[model samples]
Target: DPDPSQLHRSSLVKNLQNIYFLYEGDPVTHENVKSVDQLLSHDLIYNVSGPNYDKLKTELKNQEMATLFKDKNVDIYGVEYYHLCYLCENAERSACIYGGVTNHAGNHLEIPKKIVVKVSIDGIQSLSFDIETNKKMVTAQELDYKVRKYLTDNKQLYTNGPSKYETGYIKFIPKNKESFWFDFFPEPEFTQSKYLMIYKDNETLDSNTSQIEVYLTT
Candidate 1:
């Protein structure tokens, strides 16, 4: 049976030839189709509603909260840009997820042509990335150290980390598709800009490459 919440990702990997998907500790192929795609295509939208929106309006904007309760739906969008439902194997280091990323449109505004990303499932070591886009070799900001601390402080997904087979930085450019690099970082986002390199604290984009970044999401 199909999932009601719309989490299964066969559609994302349907055309892939040999990509691997994760079920946390378990590694599965594209055929079985379980887990969320670790790499996301777009940013997320956070909208608050119900009593919370009303409360915010009442408390923060009591001046404007009096007659704003129209009982309308919160109208949240942006779920399309996420792949959090699927599982992750390695990160920008591997080749498998790259297939799904090129195919998946986390958002329609941008279609990814190439990407490079790395994630420490173990979250124990520091993350240093090397990518070149726009004819420039890109390096990490002070953000890498902070991200390392963040990962180390947080729990790891797998006990030993990604299987060696699935562990490696993602570095691939499909034929004829590399004419233009997809700049996932120019999107720097507290909005999409904040999420450009890292989406909702899960993905990190190493800009200048239009090409690469990585984040760890379930």
Candidate 2:
């Protein structure tokens, strides 16, 4: 259990809840990103044409209207609150969660007028396991224990890292029929939390050797 006095040092419960919905993808590492405005300029968010295309169109119009006035700027708000997750080639790579907002000139048709944002992922916090096996059935208990042991064995590396906080224990969830399941060991309240799931499209474990992937979610 975490020290009750230190709970205040932890991020807000609401902020923690937002972590679960982040998309699993490569981290945004473009050096051109000085503000949320520059960040949104990236293809990742701007080219994100999806079911919300209609809403995006409406936002573009509003921005265009705002830009009509030379002195006015179309502001993109709520970027600091974005939840971000990055998949990397190395576990030691550092990532940052951000908190800030930026403005768009809106005069440029190329720039987006509005964007959806969430919590900034500045550093590492916790890890989770989501593995699928070939034909053998695995119990959550067995998987969880192995993961815990792995983290414990490398406690020095994680505890002494450059991240702001110590890495907490791993959240183990073996992919089965359901997309996700509950975790009961750390705290009952967090049992419903699914913030740390990580997997690949063709990811599958061999029947001969057991394997797990540890994902870092800030």
Candidate 3:
């Protein structure tokens, strides 16, 4: 078990969570995005062609009066949230799950707005094995012994080269599903939380190995 005292370290917790979520690919927005008065000063707007609008109107109702608009009932097209809007179509949407995010913008887009999630902890308090595939076959006992051994063997690697990196151990929380957290940090020179590494095993013997990288953040 992680010492209750160490797990509560506010700065470490906050920093770790921040680093994890930030690198996990949140959203960034460009500030100073000016709303064009002439372009978007309308009530209803659609970016489709006039034929599409006609079709939509027909769908809404066949009445031609519905297409009429007063000055208060202005409608526009091709407008967007802002110039710097990250136009991630379906193919690119998945990129937001990690650091590989995309954005589009120009002049006023210099100012950036971003959304991020963060948590605070002294360090790894406990861990829940995030592996998706091993859900049914692995037992808690098997998981704990192996992980504990791995940490024991790697102790010098984790504890020797970093900030208050001493005095921590890894252990399973002891349930049908196993989880654990250990004291770890990237080497001081690396400037990231890249020290924690993860691995994957294929269901079959002939499959390839996959790596789950945990980037270090302070």
Candidate 4:
């Protein structure tokens, strides 16, 4: 039997990877920037629709929302070249949601290669990450190591907080085919962006990296 839940979790990870990649660039024009309300008025990404989209849009937009934090000194001119996703994980779900801010300070500041934030998950099986790489090949072992480190570093966050992410496992399915480019770009020029199929455990499913399959499906 096919596990739709697993597929959905993997898809969400892939979606965010492509979205952030598309949002990456030099300081965009001020006019191109959009506020949270402006983004919710339209569909920014094709597959991102309904409640899940609205939840994240609302969560990140509200600067007063203490659950989601931002550095005051970060100097964000406008929410133009940035993206944010609120991940939902529990005993039955797992995700790696992310966010990024653009830089328009001319030569003063440069865009970060990677950005990571703490997410609230309701299950023991949770995954978190902060990554940046130009390496030609990224293996499953490498990804597993990062997630383990995240769990260890944030041990206090889980062990002591109202919510936690412990005892979770991850599997990676390499999405390296050229055909997958259309999802992220209309006319993607020579780009080095790559993706990984992240399968997070909710409970019912076993976390086996060897079980990850290679296929051409979103």
User: Which residue pairs in candidate 4 collide?
Assistant: none
Local accuracy of candidate 2 as per-residue lDDT tens digits, 103-209 = 33322233222211111122342444232221232233224333433343443212221223322323222334223222212222332122222211112222224
lDDT of each: 0.24, 0.25, 0.24, 0.25
Q: Estimate the TM-score of every prediction.
A: 0.18, 0.22, 0.20, 0.22
Quote the positional error of residue 91 for candidate 2 in Å. Answer: 46
Q: What is the lDDT of residue 92 in candidate 1?
A: 20
**TM-score of model 4 (CA atoms):** 0.22
Q: List, residue by residue over 1-218, the lDDT tens digit for candidate 3.
A: 34545532323332343222222322222222222212122221222223212111011111222223211222211101121222224322211110110111221222322211111223543322222222222222223223333332342223221223323333333223334454442222322213222111101110012212121223
Candidate 2's displacement at residue 212, Å, is 5.4
Model 3 clash tally?
13
Q: Which lDDT tens digits does candidate 1 get at residues 121-160?
A: 3344345444222212112222222233233334332223
How many residue pairs of model 2 clash at the backbone? 12
The candidate with the higher TM-score, 3 or 4, is 4
Off by over 4 Å in 4: 1-120, 123-129, 156-166, 176-218
